Amino acid sequence: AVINHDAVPVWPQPEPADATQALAVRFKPQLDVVNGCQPYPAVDPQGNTSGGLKPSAAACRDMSKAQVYSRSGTYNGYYAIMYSWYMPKDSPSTGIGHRHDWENVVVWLDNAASANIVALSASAHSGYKKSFPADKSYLDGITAKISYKSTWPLDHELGFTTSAGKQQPLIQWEQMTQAARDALESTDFGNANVPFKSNFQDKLVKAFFQ
Ligand SMILES: [Mg+2]
């Protein structure tokens, strides 16, 4: 069930057991948290989930809690790696915003063997921002440079940035326990929505770049 936001353990990044998992490690992005919460763990291996924070960043700024998620798939012939972050709240100012935040970037490859980045999609309030072709100034090698930021009074959302960012231990949907996948599918995150549950393919359709 729901546990304290700061009591969800960080899920250690395992070794990649196959090429799917190795690719998601290889393309892990950088995140520049400009304002708002740092990313936190949303779920544990028993399927307990974060209770988040009431909108009211001192409670969500602990760098040791860093975590990133991913799920991989295909759409329209292209290979997609969705990276997703959970924040305990999305509150531009006191009395504005809501408990929980789920954001995601899609890294699009031509295919999983060639593994050329063809585009990037970053979640925002109106829908996905798209960089097509992927702007070289948003790439540190093959590492996408992403920002997390609220422009008041709008919710905190993702964007592309030239600034270097930080990385987090990655646990992939494909590496989770069944209890954790079940909890991410069924848990009510209120105004926020897990973007890599049974809605994954629908999100890829919205993130697609041409
Ligand atoms: Mg948000």
Experimental method: X-ray
Question: Which of left, alpha, beta for 202 (phi over 0: left; psi -120 to 50: alpha)?
Answer: alpha
98 assigned ligand-binding residue: no
Strand partners of residue 40: 86
What is the three-state SS of 82-135? EEEEEEEEECCCCCCCEEEEEEEEEEEECCCCCCCEEEEEECCCCCCEEECCCC
The answer to the question of whether 90 is labelled as a binding residue is: yes
**42: its two tokens:** 């949303």
| Prior bond of 12 cis (ω within 30°) | no
Which residue has tokens 């992005």?
29
Q: If you measure from the C-alpha of residue 134 to the centroid of ligand 1, how many angstroms do you get, rounded to a whole number?
A: 23
Domain map of the chain by residue range?
1-210
Q: Which residues contact 48 (CB under 8 A, 6 or more apart)?
A: 1, 2, 3, 8, 183
Residue 140 is labelled as binding a ligand: no
DSSP three-state, residue 208: coil
Distance CA 161, CA 163 (A): 5
